[PDB]
Write an enzyme that holds these catalytic residues in place. Structure first.
Site, short mmCIF file in Angstrom:
data_model
loop_
_atom_site.label_atom_id
_atom_site.label_comp_id
_atom_site.label_asym_id
_atom_site.label_seq_id
_atom_site.Cartn_x
_atom_site.Cartn_y
_atom_site.Cartn_z
N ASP A 134 0.82 -1.38 -0.60
CA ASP A 134 0.22 0.08 -0.09
C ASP A 134 0.99 1.06 0.20
O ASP A 134 0.15 2.47 1.13
CB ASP A 134 -0.62 0.35 0.78
CG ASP A 134 -2.39 1.13 0.53
OD1 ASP A 134 -2.45 1.44 0.64
OD2 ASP A 134 -3.29 -0.14 -0.16
N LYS A 136 2.09 5.10 -0.70
CA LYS A 136 1.00 5.63 -1.20
C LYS A 136 1.68 7.23 -0.20
O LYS A 136 1.75 6.42 0.97
CB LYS A 136 0.10 5.64 -1.40
CG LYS A 136 -0.98 4.94 0.27
CD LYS A 136 -2.32 5.15 -0.09
CE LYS A 136 -3.03 4.55 -1.18
NZ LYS A 136 -2.01 2.67 -1.49
N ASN A 139 0.28 6.93 3.57
CA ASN A 139 0.78 6.19 4.69
C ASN A 139 2.81 6.33 4.35
O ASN A 139 3.63 4.95 5.08
CB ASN A 139 0.65 4.13 3.53
CG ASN A 139 -0.51 3.45 4.47
OD1 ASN A 139 -0.85 4.35 5.29
ND2 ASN A 139 -0.67 3.03 2.90
#
Ligand SMILES: [Cl-]
Ligand SMILES: [Cl-]
Ligand SMILES: [Cl-]
Ligand SMILES: [Cl-]
Ligand SMILES: [Cl-]
Ligand SMILES: [Cl-]
Ligand SMILES: [Cl-]
Ligand SMILES: [Cl-]
Ligand SMILES: [Cl-]
Ligand SMILES: [Cl-]
Lengths: 273, 272
Positions: A134, A136, A139
């Site tokens: 994940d 991105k 994050n």
């Protein structure tokens, strides 16, 4: 560390909820020190087959204490839950920071430093057979002095960063992280992600089928274009792999050892406690 | 690191002034980053003492990365000056901090953590064959979040921390650092140094010949008293050494691996 239990932390606020975990801002009783405490249901961990992830977090990553992965201070249990007391990052995340700068664009020295810090984190995770999945801006958390730290990988925009591999097969490999890393580098330098559309269908088609294009209005070094292009090869089998990413000429002018030592500061960091 | 010279740093203020060197707060031009830069006139390198110190800083200490040794970013020279750009410590030094807390005493958890961090710095220096020789609160800087860091590239109080070894022979071994460490632990827990006087001659006589005395108005664990006493043995040969210090029961509630990872925070830190 002291033999703490849940009684030794006072909840001050909530920081988020999940499927079987939640995070609270806590203060350690008897001190002025704040932490982000993740509270995870034990039965939930068993039902979601997360025991290996917990073991790696608690017994492997905690020993490495990587500068660009979240620091873990304590792990302990109650009857029904496991507790992870981690660093509280009040400096926001990279999505908010980039949306607040002019043109949404970070300059080359900042993009290169953040890219190097994030790459070091991803490479460490892969060495432990962890796929972040994940990557991105939301994050990537920022420290008080402006360095990047990956958010808790157990916990976790996303449509723009999804790799062709995940859309087609839902198959997660190290290569999906390098795809997302290429999206992130492009985003920092260009002010936007490379693939967009008026709805999710068009976005996914462009991810799968559209050639990478760089903005004519942004000055990007040829080495950055080369590295991003190789990271965004559609077929995972031909995508650039970790050793070649780390050795790529784009990283000329940054020493990864000095980055790991926190000797390369962000030139324009805007501290805001 | 990017190549720099004096022209790449703008002086904001002066932090310290010395015989042949000064420390200033500076900002790297083109950035918002601040550092502390020591400037050393090469004229002061005629003294063998000052020459050796700069030699150790440029060639040995510059290569050490340690959480509790002051970080050095750049070192370079001009025609007649030497430059050390190091991290600026926002918390000031342990001397000011201890003179601000009530009764000038640090509590046991804070004293043990700071003692542990200072010990880790001292042991690393000894592994590199460096004798710090000037351990005292003025040379212990504080990070923005309350950790102790030994000053490595600063300007050369002091009379209260000098070991009998130095007074007698003017000669130095690793033992002098452990004497100063003993004085420091005593200072943190008790609010004062063990040996004082109405003048410098009295202070030195007490260091040389007066038995260590603990205050009757301050209660400290027997383990803290034992370690300080072993550190303040006046004969260098019989003074406690590095490995025995690290293994001493006084450190029971501390894990040195966690301290090295900055996972043990000061409980009462006041980031002002
Ligand atoms: Cl408190
Ligand atoms: Cl397993
Ligand atoms: Cl259970
Ligand atoms: Cl989890
Ligand atoms: Cl740090
Ligand atoms: Cl030079
Ligand atoms: Cl020497
Ligand atoms: Cl020795
Ligand atoms: Cl020794
Ligand atoms: Cl150790």
């Amino acid at each position: 560390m002291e033999k703490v239990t849940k009684e030794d932390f006072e909840t001050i606020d909530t920081l988020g909820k999940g499927s079987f975990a939640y995070v609270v801002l806590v203060r350690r009783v008897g001190t002025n020190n704040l932490y982000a405490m993740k509270v995870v249901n034990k039965q939930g961990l068993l039902d979601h087959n997360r025991c290996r992830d917990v073991f790696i977090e608690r017994n492997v990553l905690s020993r490495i204490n990587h500068p660009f992965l979240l620091k873990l201070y304590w792990t302990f249990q109650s009857e029904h839950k496991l507790f992870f007391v981690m660093e509280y990052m009040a400096g926001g995340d990279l999505d908010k920071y980039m949306n607040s700068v002019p043109n949404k664009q970070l300059d080359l020295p900042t993009s290169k430093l953040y890219g190097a810090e994030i790459l070091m984190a991803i490479l460490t995770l892969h060495e432990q057979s962890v796929i972040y999945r994940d990557l991105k801006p939301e994050n990537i958390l920022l420290t008080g002095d402006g360095h990047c730290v990956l958010a808790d990988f157990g916990l976790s925009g996303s449509p723009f960063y999804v790799a062709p591999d995940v859309l087609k097969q839902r198959e997660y490999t190290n290569a999906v992280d390098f795809w997302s890393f290429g999206i992130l580098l492009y985003r920092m330098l260009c002010g936007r992600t490379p693939f967009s559309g008026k709805n999710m269908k068009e976005v996914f088609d462009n991810i799968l089928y559209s050639d990478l294009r760089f903005p004519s209005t942004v000055s990007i070094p040829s080495e950055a274009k080369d590295l991003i292009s190789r990271l965004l090869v559609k077929d995972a089998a031909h995508r650039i792999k970790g050793p070649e990413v780390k050795a790529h000429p784009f990283w000329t002018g940054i020493n990864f050892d000095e980055v790991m030592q926190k000797k390369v500061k962000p030139p324009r960091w805007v501290p805001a406690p």
